[PDB]
Amino acid sequence: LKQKNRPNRLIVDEAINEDNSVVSLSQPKMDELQLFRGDTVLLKGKKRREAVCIVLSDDTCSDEKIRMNRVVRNNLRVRLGDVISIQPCPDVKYGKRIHVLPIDDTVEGITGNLFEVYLKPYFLEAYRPIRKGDIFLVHGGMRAVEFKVVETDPSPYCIVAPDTVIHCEGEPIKREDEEESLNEVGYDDIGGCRKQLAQIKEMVELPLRHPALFKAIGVKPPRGILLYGPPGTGKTLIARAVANETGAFFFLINGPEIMSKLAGESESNLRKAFEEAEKNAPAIIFIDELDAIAPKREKTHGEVERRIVSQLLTLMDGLKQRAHVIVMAATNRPNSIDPALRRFGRFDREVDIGIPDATGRLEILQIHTKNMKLADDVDLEQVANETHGHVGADLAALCSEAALQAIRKKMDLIDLEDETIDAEVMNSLAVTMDDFRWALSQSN
Amino acid sequence: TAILKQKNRPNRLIVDEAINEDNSVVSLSQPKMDELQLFRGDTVLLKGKKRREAVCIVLSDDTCSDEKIRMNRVVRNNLRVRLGDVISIQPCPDVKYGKRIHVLPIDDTVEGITGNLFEVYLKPYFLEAYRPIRKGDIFLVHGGMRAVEFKVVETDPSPYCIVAPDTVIHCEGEPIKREDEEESLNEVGYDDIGGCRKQLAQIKEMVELPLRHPALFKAIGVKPPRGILLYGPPGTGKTLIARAVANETGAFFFLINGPEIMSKLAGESESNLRKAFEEAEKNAPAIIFIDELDAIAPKREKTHGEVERRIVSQLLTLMDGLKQRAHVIVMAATNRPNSIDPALRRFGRFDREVDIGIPDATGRLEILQIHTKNMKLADDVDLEQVANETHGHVGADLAALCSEAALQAIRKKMDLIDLEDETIDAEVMNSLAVTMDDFRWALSQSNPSALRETVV
Numbered sequence: 001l002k003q004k005n006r007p008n009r010l011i012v013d014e015a016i017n018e019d020n021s022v023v024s025l026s027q028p029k030m031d032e033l034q035l036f037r038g039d040t041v042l043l044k045g046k047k048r049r050e051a052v053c054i055v056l057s058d059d060t061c062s063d064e065k066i067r068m069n070r071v072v073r074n075n076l077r078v079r080l081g082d083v084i085s086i087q088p089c090p091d092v093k094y095g096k097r098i099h100v101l102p103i104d105d106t107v108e109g110i111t112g113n114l115f116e117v118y119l120k121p122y123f124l125e126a127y128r129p130i131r132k133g134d135i136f137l138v139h140g141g142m143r144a145v146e147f148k149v150v151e152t153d154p155s156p157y158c159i160v161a162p163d164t165v166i167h168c169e170g171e172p173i174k175r176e177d178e179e180e181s182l183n184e185v186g187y188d189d190i191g192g193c194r195k196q197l198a199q200i201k202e203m204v205e206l207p208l209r210h211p212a213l214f215k216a217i218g219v220k221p222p223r224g225i226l227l228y229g230p231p232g233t234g235k236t237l238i239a240r241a242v243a244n245e246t247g248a249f250f251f252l253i254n255g256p257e258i259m260s261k262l263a264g265e266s267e268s269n270l271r272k273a274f275e276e277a278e279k280n281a282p283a284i285i286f287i288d289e290l291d292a293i294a295p296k297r298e299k300t301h302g303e304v305e306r307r308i309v310s311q312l313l314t315l316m317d318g319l320k321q322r323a324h325v326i327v328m329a330a331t332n333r334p335n336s337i338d339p340a341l342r343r344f345g346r347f348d349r350e351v352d353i354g355i356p357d358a359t360g361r362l363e364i365l366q367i368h369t370k371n372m373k374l375a376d377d378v379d380l381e382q383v384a385n386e387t388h389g390h391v392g393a394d395l396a397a398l399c400s401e402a403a404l405q406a407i408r409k410k411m412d413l414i415d416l417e418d419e420t421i422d423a424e425v426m427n428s429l430a431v432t433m434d435d436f437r438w439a440l441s442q443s444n
Numbered sequence: 445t446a447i448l449k450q451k452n453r454p455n456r457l458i459v460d461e462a463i464n465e466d467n468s469v470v471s472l473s474q475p476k477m478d479e480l481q482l483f484r485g486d487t488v489l490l491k492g493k494k495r496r497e498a499v500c501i502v503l504s505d506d507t508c509s510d511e512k513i514r515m516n517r518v519v520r521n522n523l524r525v526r527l528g529d530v531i532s533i534q535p536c537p538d539v540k541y542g543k544r545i546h547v548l549p550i551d552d553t554v555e556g557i558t559g560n561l562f563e564v565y566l567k568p569y570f571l572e573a574y575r576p577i578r579k580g581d582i583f584l585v586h587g588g589m590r591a592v593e594f595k596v597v598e599t600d601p602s603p604y605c606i607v608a609p610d611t612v613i614h615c616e617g618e619p620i621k622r623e624d625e626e627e628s629l630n631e632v633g634y635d636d637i638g639g640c641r642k643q644l645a646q647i648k649e650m651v652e653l654p655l656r657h658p659a660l661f662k663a664i665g666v667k668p669p670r671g672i673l674l675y676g677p678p679g680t681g682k683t684l685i686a687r688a689v690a691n692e693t694g695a696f697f698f699l700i701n702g703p704e705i706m707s708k709l710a711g712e713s714e715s716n717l718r719k720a721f722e723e724a725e726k727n728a729p730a731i732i733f734i735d736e737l738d739a740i741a742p743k744r745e746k747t748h749g750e751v752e753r754r755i756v757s758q759l760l761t762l763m764d765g766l767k768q769r770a771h772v773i774v775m776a777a778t779n780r781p782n783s784i785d786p787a788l789r790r791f792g793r794f795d796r797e798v799d800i801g802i803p804d805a806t807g808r809l810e811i812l813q814i815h816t817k818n819m820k821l822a823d824d825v826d827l828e829q830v831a832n833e834t835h836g837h838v839g840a841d842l843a844a845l846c847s848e849a850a851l852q853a854i855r856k857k858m859d860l861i862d863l864e865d866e867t868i869d870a871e872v873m874n875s876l877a878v879t880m881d882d883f884r885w886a887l888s889q890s891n892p893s894a895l896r897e898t899v900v
């Protein structure tokens with residue numbers, strides 16, 4: 001399952017100084033996709049991100065490419081070189097009302113009126129298409145303020161007409177809250193697991209997306225997929241990626257969380273989870289750390305704990321064949337799970353999330369340093385070759401330790417008591433190959 | 445002995461085709477109608493598989509053989525029978541004019557523009573026709589340039605009536621899901637169990653026969669055993685048999701799931717058990733099936749909980765509480781028979797056993813035919829050769845093998861399928877078939893290959 005060439009799949013190309021509402025295509029491409037000048041289009045990027053734009057022709061734009069500015073790439077969670085999908089969006093209505101909020105670090109200090117100084121001049125007679133979850137930057141006077149679209153009516157996208165009511169009242173959105181959102185886990189955040197991600201897409205995503213395919217040939221797909229492997233191999237990471245990437249409804253069940261609940265409450269929450277997924281099908285239930293709620297019925301010295309395992313088995317069996325629900329699970333102790341849960345029609349398929357090789361280790365090292373300030377002498381392939389037996393969690397800690405050693409090297413220019421860290425200390429900070437070699441030497 | 449085989453009776457006929465025939469009409473030969481005292485236009489009751497019924501009008505037919513009954517696809521579909529199957533026919537004189545009927549469309553036949561369902565479809569279909577209909581009937585109607593499938597949801601009188609001019613036809617409500625009816629159509633019957641001919645006979649003689657004909661046992665002066673335990677290794681079709689019995693039996697059927705009872709609160713587990721036996725008693729003749737008995741009734745030694753011992757005591761009291769006039773038979777299943785409390789296996793409790801074991805080559809072929817009947821097979825697929833290469837496999841292993849062959853066939857087309865597409869390419873869909881190569885691949889992928897060693 002690799003990405004297929006389709007006429008509406010295009011490579012993200014730059015458009016410096018371009019308006020936030022505009023994407024550019026070549027004329028022959030627009031002709032092919034039956035797209036006309038001014039048409040409203042729907043763009044799809046990574047981690048289920050969407051953007052609504054106006055399409056314009058461009059003779060400097062290659063057929064296979066789409067030009068878009070930084071703000072739009074940021075909304076689609078894509079980089080230059082990435083592939084997006086484009087489709088016509090004819091059903092977009094004039095907005096009745098929209099609610100936007102400023103990002104807190106762009107509104108620090110003197111303000112004036114956000115609507116009058118920023119939003120009114122930005123939207124004025126422009127008829128901008130916008131989507132809930134859009135981030136956009138506006139210049140007003142001598143200042144820049146970043147806004148988030150929090151709600152639209154109609155939802156989740158509309159055109160901001162002259163009659164659209166623009167709301168900007170409320171407590172500003174925290175930069176840190178949106179940073180966590182921007183850097184939510186995607187499939188690109190999982191390294192050294194290419195074959196496993198393919199197994200998961202074919203056993204989980206494919207039957208939920210295309211149940212016609214399986215009915216056609218006359219096969220019922222397996223409904224229980226167990227990910228197994230040693231600690232820190234990225235089982236929970238994969239759960240998070242699936243959560244953020246899937247077209248289906250996703251309900252996470254945390255083993256320890258259910259087991260922390262009162263007697264009766266543990267079983268109740270389990271029932272509530274399966275009910276919610278059924279109602280919202282197609283759906284994925286992920287039961288993380290399955291061994292916590294479902295150990296061998298021998299290794300249980302409590303009535304409630306045996307009761308909980310019975311509850312899960314009944315819920316698995318209770319998933320009638322028309323429910324369009326797939327249950328995923330993860331464990332670092334697969335031999336410790338009750339054998340009854342691994343029977344036909346339950347968790348009958350398995351995915352080994354194991355120890356990565358040298359190439360996989362390099363993938364993980366690239367992922368965890370992508371937002372890290374690296375010096376030019378840093379050779380990550382050489383780091384990859386020196387970390388045999390390491391899993392993804394060991395490699396994350398190694399990168400962290402190199403970084404902390406880099407900070408430790410400047411504690412003779414840093415005073416803890418200071419209100420502010422010295423600017424040159426801040427701007428010069430980089431992790432060296434020496435910091436990595438030190439981290440490699442410090443060890444498990 | 446598998447001696448309970450289907451007997452030749454005058455009203456038992458072989459299902460034969462009637463292309464272009466009306467949904468309300470069945471055809472018999474004249475001598476057959478004479479024999480059964482059936483006249484032209486008489487209303488008849490047809491009985492098929494899985495307790496399915498159909499009410500039709502009978503007409504004579506000189507092209508129809510004496511031993512056969514002609515019926516169209518819609519009627520066969522309602523009786524859950526194929527060409528070649530046997531059905532029973534009987535006069536149905538007590539059928540009254542309906543006061544009201546409620547029908548609902550199937551959702552994939554009503555996608556898009558509609559008009560008026562009653563006016564365009566149902567009124568012209570029923571108009572002056574005096575059609576007999578039964579609750580649970582599925583029928584197709586042509587109206588304008590379109591076809592819409594309907595389900596009879598309720599009749600008054602229930603469960604069948606004649607749709608007269610004065611019968612009120614209701615078609616309001618949310619359309620019935622095709623998937624939901626597909627689940628119903630393919631509910632488990634005895635034909636869905638392969639490699640268990642002798643065991644199905646044991647079950648019919650120990651369960652069905654005493655519930656159906658308690659006079660037979662009273663006459664000879666014998667009390668039939670009331671506790672039947674099915675045992676055998678994982679995936680041999682014990683739960684499958686429970687489902688088949690549930691759908692085939694003339695008795696009331698109450699399922700008790702072991703794990704389900706054990707998932708309940710203290711006190712609630714025992715309460716549900718009492719409720720199950722009470723419900724079956726009230727609705728006798730009845731079958732109680734306790735699936736996975738070992739879950740609720742392990743050896744009173746292997747219990748480190750007061751409630752779990754309490755639950756076993758509860759079951760024993762309920763078994764003993766079944767007085768000899770209750771006309772209730774308790775079936776159970778387990779893959780751990782040695783792990784059940786010995787007290788439950790005493791006289792007058794679970795004192796009879798049925799070994800649901802490992803099938804032989806011929807049994808395996810039966811299972812392979814059942815699980816591929818709704819599967820698109822290429823012509824090179826030799827299921828007998830598959831049967832001969834799956835020694836040590838049980839029914840569950842054969843189901844997984846068939847699934848894996850099909851999934852491999854889909855996997856072979858992932859270079860023509862994009863995950864992100866809204867629709868799968870039509871020619872990819874229409875050409876999809878499972879090959880003998882897909883099966884050979886599946887046979888090589890294995891706890892098949894690792895399983896042929898085991899049972900020699």
Ligand SMILES: Nc1ncnc2c1ncn2[C@@H]1O[C@H](COP(=O)(O)OP(=O)(O)OP(O)(O)=S)[C@@H](O)[C@H]1O
Nearest residue numbers: 190191231232233234235236237332364392393396
């Ligand atoms: N394949 C991977 N690619 C990139 N980072 C990884 C990978 N595996 C682990 N990591 C990093 O290590 C962290 C911890 O990994 P988790 O996914 O929580 O481990 P896990 O496999 O769920 O371990 P258990 O069994 O819960 S102790 C992740 O948040 C990642 O930052």
Ligand SMILES: Nc1ncnc2c1ncn2[C@@H]1O[C@H](COP(=O)(O)OP(=O)(O)OP(O)(O)=S)[C@@H](O)[C@H]1O
Nearest residue numbers: 636637638678679680681682683684779839840843
């Ligand atoms: N004798 C059989 N004939 C046809 N299909 C079978 C047979 N046995 C098993 N199967 C298939 O395998 C599936 C699982 O069988 P079950 O009846 O659930 O197994 P079981 O004997 O109840 O296993 P345990 O003991 O609960 S683990 C069924 O739904 C069928 O699809």
Ligand SMILES: [Mg+2]
Nearest residue numbers: 235236237288
């Ligand atoms: Mg984890």
Ligand SMILES: [Mg+2]
Nearest residue numbers: 682683684735
């Ligand atoms: Mg079973």
